[PDB]
Amino acid sequence: ATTVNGGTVHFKGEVVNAACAVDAGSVDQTVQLGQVRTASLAQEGATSSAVGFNIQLNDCDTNVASKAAVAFLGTAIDAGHTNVLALQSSAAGSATNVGVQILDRTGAALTLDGATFSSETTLNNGTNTIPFQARYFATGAATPGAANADATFKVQYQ
Amino acid sequence: ATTVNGGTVHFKGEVVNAACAVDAGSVDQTVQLGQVRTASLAQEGATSSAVGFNIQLNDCDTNVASKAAVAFLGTAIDAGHTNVLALQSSAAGSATNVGVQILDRTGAALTLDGATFSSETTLNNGTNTIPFQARYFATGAATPGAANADATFKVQYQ
Amino acid sequence: ATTVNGGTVHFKGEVVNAACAVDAGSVDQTVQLGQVRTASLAQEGATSSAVGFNIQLNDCDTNVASKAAVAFLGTAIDAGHTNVLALQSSAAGSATNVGVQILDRTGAALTLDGATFSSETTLNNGTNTIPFQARYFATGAATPGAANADATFKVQYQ
Amino acid sequence: ATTVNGGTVHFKGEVVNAACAVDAGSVDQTVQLGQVRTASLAQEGATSSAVGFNIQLNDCDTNVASKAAVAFLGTAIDAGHTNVLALQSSAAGSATNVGVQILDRTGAALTLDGATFSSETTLNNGTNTIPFQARYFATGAATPGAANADATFKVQYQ
Amino acid sequence: ATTVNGGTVHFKGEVVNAACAVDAGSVDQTVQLGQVRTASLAQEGATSSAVGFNIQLNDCDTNVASKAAVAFLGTAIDAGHTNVLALQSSAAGSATNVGVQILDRTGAALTLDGATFSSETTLNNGTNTIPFQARYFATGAATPGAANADATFKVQYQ
Amino acid sequence: ATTVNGGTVHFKGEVVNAACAVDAGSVDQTVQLGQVRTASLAQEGATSSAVGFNIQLNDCDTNVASKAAVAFLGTAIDAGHTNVLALQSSAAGSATNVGVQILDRTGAALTLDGATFSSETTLNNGTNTIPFQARYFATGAATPGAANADATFKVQYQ
């Protein structure tokens, strides 16, 4: 009877030629680091507590590839800290002298140039979950403010 | 009392003469399908795993209408595949020989002419959510690339 | 003294005109089914072991209504299997030729159209628990993969 | 090495002499109100349900100002309805006898002359968010159609 | 070997100059209130059962501050009901004549203006948990519909 | 069958001989920086917080090129600061003693002569995203006003 205009639906995805496929929940995910105190980030080299996040690989075929690694890409805080991600929320109110570090399963920070891959993880058939950690890294006396950062990752299958 | 120009706000919506009103989160929504492998789309008729998405109807009045169906409208991939969405990302980097299928609650792919409505769903008073699925449909050997599509829908009340 | 921006809280709920109200722990819930072997779903019509889940009704008034029934609404796997839920997780890595069946308190699989309600259960004043079961149903030789599914339910009072 | 013309980037922003700075997300935001039924706007004074939106203030310094208020500027629907936004999308297809009201944190509709400010909110150092609501206001029997509106705002720091 | 595009990760957090830091789970959290009957909200001042939620403070240093209090900020439902939240789901389908009240650990409803703080709770070193309650408050005869509300909070340390 | 003149459609594009093609969403993009306080740009060398923006590359073929770099072109603020974009919106209302800097993924401001390319990023097949940041740079005591700027970019595939 009564027909009414509704709305629109936008579909996002990607076709890849690879052993696995990144899960829909891992392609674009938000990691809540929570609040941190300036007293913790008092001087250069100070780190906060870590927050874990995962990249889940679906439909993995170990015949095609048995190892998977992840390289992250983003804007570094400066030239002397190539593994510290810079904060980019807005033009005002961001924290100063602090950035975000991404750790792979070996506990070491990853270079954010998109070429340095993480430690390879052996894959099984089906679902695979690559663990990662995120934490704040102080490049000096940290200043209060928002600390939001963004990075892209690419997966290597061997 | 320092007064400062702040910005601007744009309001979007629609007044409809219908038994239900589409929810604000369903009028415009993004469905993340995730990555898919070319090995799963190696020949015509090959489909992917489905991703669900809902259209929520608010303030439903069963005295006005008891059923609700949804018809989708979009660009078809071919003349013989009138139920497969074509991809619309950009002029480069898009996947080939693959499209998006919208499944109603019966599991059948809907025609995207804007006139073939879904299987009717009985409505209660108040909130109603109509389920749908999206999956990739291969029209041949799929090529790697971005797979983004979008469609509009209209709701019929009987 | 030192005041700091803390965060945000989101409140979700619903006001209904009904004899009972669904408990906050039953409006949305995750039912863990566990793993299942493909050897137990080797042909069409094969079913797995059942996992139980409950919908709790609070503040029931027997004067207003004495019996409660539940209907479930979700995407069906096929047109010949209108009582089998379709898997819904992501675009890659989900199991094929297998779905999820919801059983009412009589053991019969419920149709997922949202208009065929379960067996009516007599209610008492206050808390009421309506039992349900979920299991995997094979529409053929099932393949390995993720087996997630979602469905919404309606409550009818007489 | 192949050098190719890429494109253009446009940067928008504003320098202010104020205690706070409006966040980049609050400078130009779209508020999706969703659909509304005509039966909910059948006579003058009938309002719809509200949709919330925020204006975020960054880098707030309470030593400069401790309170913040917001005034909105837009085209009113009528002379006697100075707190109802007139709809403006195109020359055809718009709804009639209905507009948009902006409610401050006290729940009162704001006058849209750009001089009547909202209730002041105490500010803390750093990030501050000011809650607002939007709803449809009917000046008569609402007619179906598009219901888009636009309003600019300014922030007063005391 | 084979390298493919993955996805993107968004990190969200905040650096604060405070005695404690709000936990990652408390910065954003959804409180599920469940359903409520209209019969329990039949007149002004009628309240539903409370649902508990708590804000967790981490890395607390009792030398810096010994007590913490919370003030909530949201859109009030009326001028005479400053301690009752207003619903914000969509333009249609929301309940009328009912809001959300946030109760302190002393059982008193908090004023939603961001300046009236809760009762101070003495802090210990390490993890601290501030309990709160949420309930429905009726300003009249409540109407069936969705009841969703949003509130932001700030923490005071002294 | 009533036929009516409808309107006109303009198509903008470019054919390039390169390993990658710039995505339609990044050929002409608007970067909303937000607001900034004059107190944060009080003296020469003071910078604001950064805002991130990306240039997406499509249909990348690593057999043709494996590295990509971006150079930006625009009017500098003066001869001393060749890496600061001058502001341009109109004859009146622009901010004084402040410009816009573009940071590459290494966090270093780029020279705006159209020939100093950014740090090379390793490319994968298909979609590639090169990160960038924008921030305000004070050449003295900044004056309130509009702070819009425009720059073009070119991509070098080596």
**What is the 3-state secondary structure of chain B?**
CEEEEEEEEEEEEEEECCCCEECHHHHEEEEEEEEEEHHHHCCCCCECCCEEEEEEEEEECCCCCCEEEEEEECCECCCCCCCCECCCCCCCCECCCEEEEEECCCCCECCCECCCCCCCEECCCEEEEEEEEEEEEECCCCCCEECCEEEEEEEEEC
Q: Are E5 and A150 a contacting pair, CB within 8 Å?
A: no
Q: Please count the residue pairs, one from chain D and one from chain E, whose beta carbons lie less than 8 angstroms apart.
A: 81
Q: Are E88 and E148 a contacting pair, CB within 8 Å?
A: yes
The number of residues in chain B equals 158
Q: In what order do the strands lie in the sheet with B98-103?
A: B21-22, B51-60, B126-138, B98-103
Q: Are D54 and D129 a contacting pair, CB within 8 Å?
A: yes
Residue corresponding to tokens 């030192």? C2
Residue C61: what residue type? D
**CA–CA distance, E101 with E51 (Å, rounded to integer):** 10
| Helix/strand/coil for F88 | coil
**CA–CA distance, A157 with A67 (Å, rounded to integer):** 6
Residues ≥6 apart with Cβ < 8 Å to C62: C19, C123, C124, C125
- Which among A91, A144, A145 has the least Cβ separation from residue D24? A91
Report yes or no: B92 at the F interface, CB cutoff 8 Å.
yes
| Helix/strand/coil for C43 | coil
Residue F117: what residue type? F
State the pairing for strand pair C2-16/E28-37: parallel
Q: How far is CA B126 from the centre of its chain?
A: 22
- Which among F49, F103, F126 has the least Cβ separation from residue A92? F49
How far CA E8 is from CA of A22, A57, A143, in Å, comes to 11, 14, 27
Q: Copy the structure tokens of residue A84.
A: 């510290």
Residues in chain B after which the backbone breaks (C–N beyond 2.5 Å): none
Q: Copy the structure tokens of residue F102.
A: 């573009």
The secondary structure of residue A5, as a DSSP letter, is E
Minimum CA–CA partner of E14 in chain A? A146
**CA–CA distance, E66 with E121 (Å, rounded to integer):** 8
Cβ-count burial F49-71 (b if 16+ within 10 Å, e if not): bbbbbbbbbbbbebeebbbbbbb
How far CA E41 is from CA of B64, B104, C143, E142, in Å, comes to 27, 38, 51, 6
Q: Are B89 and B146 a contacting pair, CB within 8 Å?
A: yes
**CA–CA distance, E34 with E40 (Å, rounded to integer):** 14
Radius of gyration of chain D (CA): 19
Minimum CA–CA partner of C94 in chain B? B49
**CA–CA distance, A88 with A78 (Å, rounded to integer):** 13
Q: Kindly write down the DSSP assignment for every residue of E101-123, as one continuous string.
A: EEE-TTSPBPPTBSSS----EE-
- CB atoms near residue A39 (< 10 Å): 16
Distance from CA of A76 to the nearest CA of B (A): 27
Q: Are B9 and D154 a contacting pair, CB within 8 Å?
A: no
**CA–CA distance, D130 with E150 (Å, rounded to integer):** 12
| Helix/strand/coil for C16 | strand
The secondary structure of residue E83, as a DSSP letter, is T
E98-E47-E106 Cα angle (round to 5) = 120
Q: Copy the structure tokens of residue F61.
A: 């073929």
Q: Are F24 and B91 a contacting pair, CB within 8 Å?
A: yes
Report yes or no: B25 at the C interface, CB cutoff 8 Å.
no
Residues ≥6 apart with Cβ < 8 Å to F63: none
- Which among B49, B122, B124 has the least Cβ separation from residue C89? B49
Residues from chain A contacting residue D126 (CB–CB below 8 Å): 93, 144-146
- Which among A18, A41, A151 has the least Cβ separation from residue E15? A41
How far CA F59 is from CA of B146, C158, F20, in Å, comes to 9, 61, 5
Q: What are phi and psi of D98, to 5 degrees?
A: -150, 150
Distance from CA of E142 to the nearest CA of B (A): 14
Top residue of A26, A57, A59, A124 to mutate, by most chain C CBs within 10 Å, is A59
Distance from CA of A3 to the nearest CA of F (A): 22
| Helix/strand/coil for F81 | coil
Q: Are B21 and E92 a contacting pair, CB within 8 Å?
A: yes
What residues are paired with A4 via a beta bridge? B155
Helix (H) or strand (E) holding B4: strand B2-16
Residues ≥6 apart with Cβ < 8 Å to F11: none
The number of residues in chain D equals 158
Q: What are phi and psi of B68, to 5 degrees?
A: -150, 130
Residues D119, B2, D21, D83: is their CA dihedral positive or negative? positive
Q: Kindly write down the DSSP assignment for every residue of F98-151, as one continuous string.
A: EEEEEE-TTS-BPPSBS------EE--SEEEEEEEEEEEEESSSPPPEE--EEE
Q: In what order do the strands lie in the sheet with C67-73?
A: C121-122, C67-73, C152-157
CA-closest candidate to residue A134, choices A56, A76, A54:
A54
Q: Is E130 left (phi over 0), alpha (psi -120 to 50) or beta?
A: beta
Q: How many helices (H) and strands (E) in chain E?
A: 1, 10
Q: Copy the structure tokens of residue C89.
A: 């997780």
C61-C66-C70 Cα angle (round to 5) = 100
**CA–CA distance, A20 with B94 (Å, rounded to integer):** 19
C144 to A127: CB separation less than 8 angstroms, yes or no: no
Q: Are F71 and F118 a contacting pair, CB within 8 Å?
A: yes
Residues from chain A contacting residue E17 (CB–CB below 8 Å): 37-38, 144
Distance from CA of C109 to the nearest CA of D (A): 36
Q: Are F140 and A95 a contacting pair, CB within 8 Å?
A: no
First to last CA, chain B: 57
Residues B73, B75, B79, B80: is their CA dihedral positive or negative? negative
Q: Are F85 and F58 a contacting pair, CB within 8 Å?
A: no
How far CA D144 is from CA of D96, D101, E23, E111, in Å, comes to 7, 18, 47, 39
Chains touching chain E at 3 or more Cβ pairs under 8 angstroms? A, B, C, D, F
Helix (H) or strand (E) holding B24: helix B24-27
Q: Do chains D and B touch (3 or more CB pairs under 8 A)?
A: yes
Report yes or no: B131 at the E interface, CB cutoff 8 Å.
no
**CA–CA distance, A102 with A112 (Å, rounded to integer):** 9
Minimum CA–CA partner of E116 in chain D? D122
Q: How far is CA D36 from the centre of its chain?
A: 19
Q: What are phi and psi of C129, to 5 degrees?
A: -120, 120
Residue F51: what residue type? V
B144 to F125: CB separation less than 8 angstroms, yes or no: yes
Residues ≥6 apart with Cβ < 8 Å to E92: B21, B23, B58, B59, D34, D35, D36, D37, D40, D48, D49
Residues from chain E contacting residue B127 (CB–CB below 8 Å): 93, 145-146
Residues from chain C contacting residue E17 (CB–CB below 8 Å): 2, 4
Residues from chain D contacting residue E96 (CB–CB below 8 Å): 49
State the pairing for strand pair C51-60/F21-22: unpaired
**CA–CA distance, B25 with B22 (Å, rounded to integer):** 8
Q: Are F71 and F156 a contacting pair, CB within 8 Å?
A: yes
C2 to E27: CB separation less than 8 angstroms, yes or no: no
Residue corresponding to tokens 């992250």? A72
Q: Kindly write down the DSSP assignment for every residue of D14-53, as one continuous string.
A: EEE-SSSEE-HHHHEEEEEEEEEEGGGG-STT-B---EEE
Q: Are E51 and E32 a contacting pair, CB within 8 Å?
A: yes
Minimum CA–CA partner of C18 in chain E? E37
The secondary structure of residue B114, as a DSSP letter, is S
**CA–CA distance, B110 with B154 (Å, rounded to integer):** 13
What residues are paired with C44 via a beta bridge? none
Report yes or no: B145 at the F interface, CB cutoff 8 Å.
yes
F136 to D15: CB separation less than 8 angstroms, yes or no: yes
On the 0-12 / 13-18 / 19+ scale of CB atoms within 10 A, B114 is: middle
Q: Are A113 and F105 a contacting pair, CB within 8 Å?
A: yes
CA-closest candidate to residue E72, choices E51, E50, E93, E101:
E101
Minimum CA–CA partner of E20 in chain C? C4
Q: Are F33 and D24 a contacting pair, CB within 8 Å?
A: yes
What residues are paired with B67 via a beta bridge? B122
A51-A52-A58 Cα angle (round to 5) = 155
**CA–CA distance, B133 with E72 (Å, rounded to integer):** 39
Q: Copy the structure tokens of residue A77.
A: 């805080």
C92 to A58: CB separation less than 8 angstroms, yes or no: yes
The secondary structure of residue B107, as a DSSP letter, is S
Q: Do chains F and C touch (3 or more CB pairs under 8 A)?
A: no
On the 0-12 / 13-18 / 19+ scale of CB atoms within 10 A, D63 is: exposed
Residues ≥6 apart with Cβ < 8 Å to B34: A13, A14, A21, A22, A23, A24, A25, A26, A27, A58, B51, C90, C91, C92
CA-closest candidate to residue A14, choices F121, B80, F129:
F129
Structure resolution, Å: 2.5
F133 to A74: CB separation less than 8 angstroms, yes or no: no
CA-closest candidate to residue C134, choices C74, C44, C79, C59:
C74
Q: Copy the structure tokens of residue C48.
A: 């797995």
**CA–CA distance, C54 with C26 (Å, rounded to integer):** 7
Distance from CA of F100 to the nearest CA of D (A): 8
Residues from chain B contacting residue E89 (CB–CB below 8 Å): 23-24, 58
The secondary structure of residue C154, as a DSSP letter, is E
State the pairing for strand pair C21-22/F51-60: unpaired
Q: Please count the residue pairs, one from chain C and one from chain E, whose beta carbons lie less than 8 angstroms apart.
A: 150
Report yes or no: F39 at the D interface, CB cutoff 8 Å.
yes
Residues A102, A104, A108, A112: is their CA dihedral positive or negative? negative
Residues from chain B contacting residue C21 (CB–CB below 8 Å): none
What residues are paired with F74 via a beta bridge? none
Q: Are D15 and F36 a contacting pair, CB within 8 Å?
A: yes
Q: Copy the structure tokens of residue C41.
A: 């779903």
